[PDB]
Amino acid sequence: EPWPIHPWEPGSSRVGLIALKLGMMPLWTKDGQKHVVTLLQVQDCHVLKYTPKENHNGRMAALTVGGKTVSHFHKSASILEFYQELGLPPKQKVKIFNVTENAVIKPGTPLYAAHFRPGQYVDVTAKTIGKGFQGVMRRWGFKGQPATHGQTKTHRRPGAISTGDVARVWPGTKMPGQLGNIDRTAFGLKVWRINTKHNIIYVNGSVPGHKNCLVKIKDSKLPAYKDFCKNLPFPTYFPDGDEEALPEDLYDENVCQPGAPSITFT
């Protein structure tokens, strides 16, 4: 029972995915340059619930997406009831994507890594590697005191924190504290390769967060690539709509494929 598909509009936005960070790989370009890609595996992406635009923000609708499957025996009663009503096993990470009202998808719809095509810019949101309660030098990068010129019990102290006349410290003072376990977003990550069989996305650059962690992927909201979704499948990628199996690996126009003639300059 698919919901009606609306035509793509210039002011429209698409829904994202929730993948798993596998690791990092090299990738060489036809010009001889070397880039580093990160593998994001879309294991289980499913639309859980749909929230109306008026009831969520008043400008854009909200689509809820679930991550990889988890066990029923460690989830709460309400979450288990929600997933029982939905008809799907519980997911680990549940996220909300702001999408336009013309790109809404029926809940319970699965999603695949072919939703992104080779050559596109995506934004990646995840919890970075949490380093715990770290010192000021590792947290804010403050220089330390000289090591052996007589300094006593001061090699890593932050030093002065405020001024004498103020008689207090400003709230914006940089001090030791929790570092790392916060949600961060990297913008403008180019995608080079899409592996369809294993649902793998090769995103250029580093991905915030440790390996084997859930990562929220969406399109780039930067003004440079605001209207790149015209050529992409607007609602989502439907493997049944085309009735044609995509190739195993979709490469960009510049990626040097593993099967190459060992390109040489002229």
Partner 1 sequence: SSFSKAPQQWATFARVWYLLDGKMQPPGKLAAMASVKLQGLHKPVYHQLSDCGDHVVIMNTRHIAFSGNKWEQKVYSSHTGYPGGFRQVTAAQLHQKDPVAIVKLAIYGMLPKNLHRRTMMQRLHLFPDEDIPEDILKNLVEELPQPRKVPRRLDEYTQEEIEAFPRVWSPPEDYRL
Q: Taking CB within 5 to 8 Å according to partner kind, which of partner 1, RNA, Mg ion, none is near residue 54?
A: none
Chain centre to alpha carbon of residue 213? 10
> x/- site string to RNA, residues 121 to 140, per CB under 7 A?
--x-x-x-xxxxx----x--
79 is a site residue for RNA (CB under 7 A): yes
Residue with tokens 């103020």: 166
Token readout for 86 is 């939905």
For residue 213, state whether it binds RNA (rule: CB under 7 A): yes
Q: How far apart are CA 144 and CA 134, in angstroms?
A: 15
Q: Does the annotation list 177 as a binding residue? A: no
DSSP string, 71-138: -GGGS-HHHHHHHHHHTSPPBS-EEEEEE-GGG---TT-EE-GGGS-SSEEEEEEEE----EEE-HHH
CA distances from 33 to 119, 173, 183, 201, 245 (A): 17, 42, 31, 20, 32
CA pair distance 256, 117, nearest whole angstrom: 17
Is 210 annotated for ligand binding?
no
Cβ proximity of 98 and 15 under 8 Å: no
Of 112 and 140, nearer to partner 1 (C-beta) is 140
Q: Choose between 2 and 182: whose C-beta lies nearer to RNA.
A: 182
C-beta of 154 vs 173, nearer to partner 1: 173
d(CA 181, CA 133): 10
Closest contact distance (angstroms) between CB of 174 and partner 1 is: 11
Provide the 8-state DSSP code for 260.
-
Query: Is residue 177 within the footprint of Mg ion (CB under 5 A)?
Result: no
Regarding 150 and contact with Mg ion (CB under 5 A), the answer is yes
Site membership for RNA, residue 29 (CB under 7 A): no
Is 167 a binding residue for Mg ion by CB under 5 A? The answer is yes
Q: In the bound complex, what is the minimum distance in angstroms from residue 55's beta carbon to partner 1? A: 17
From the list Mg ion, RNA, partner 1, none, which binds 170 (C-beta under 5 to 8 Å, kind-based)? partner 1
State the binding partner of 52 from Mg ion, RNA, partner 1, none, CB within 5 to 8 A by kind.
Answer: none
In the list 216, 235, 252, 255, the residue contacting RNA (rule: CB under 7 A) is 216
- 26: left (phi > 0), else alpha (psi -120 to 50), else beta? beta
171 interacts with, out of Mg ion, RNA, partner 1, none, CB within 5 to 8 A per kind: partner 1
Residue closer to Mg ion by CB (options 63, 179) is 179
Known binding residues = 130, 155
